[PDB]
Design a binder for these strands. Structure first.
Ligand SMILES: [Zn+2]
Ligand SMILES: [Zn+2]
Ligand SMILES: [Zn+2]
Lengths: 63, 63
DNA sequence: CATCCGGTGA
DNA sequence: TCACTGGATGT
């Protein structure tokens, strides 16, 4: 059970078409509206920016 | 030097990143372009299709 | 399978 | 950061 960082938005989406219909994908939206499809891309974002407070583990990409 | 079945392609690949980096995997490509990363999956493919001629043992996944 | 991101095209 | 999916990759 894991809370979502202030200003951020967590989106649970379901795939509609393709061989992968029904599959789920989680992604996050920053307070600035940048969208992250993975914990790695988000983590790289935290590094580029020198975020000290937020940790990659604060973001829950599982459903 | 176990031979590779006609029309099939055998690929020996090395892992570039992560924890088991530098390890080799083998996979096969059918004459139709389906890729099999494991022996079990290829064998299950031979069954679902009733392949009588090819045997799982014709496919060498070791490196 | 969990996790990822490049390909694709509206 | 285009939204959404295919299928590569290492666990
Ligand atoms: Zn808050
Ligand atoms: Zn020989
Ligand atoms: Zn031949």
């Amino acid at each position: 059970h894991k809370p979502v960082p202030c200003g951020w938005e967590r989106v649970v989406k379901q795939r509609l078409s393709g061989k992968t219909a029904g599959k789920f994908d989680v992604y996050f939206i920053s307070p600035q509206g940048l969208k992250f499809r993975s914990k790695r891309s988000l983590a790289n974002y935290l590094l580029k920016n020198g975020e000290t407070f937020l940790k990659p583990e604060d973001f829950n990409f599982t459903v």
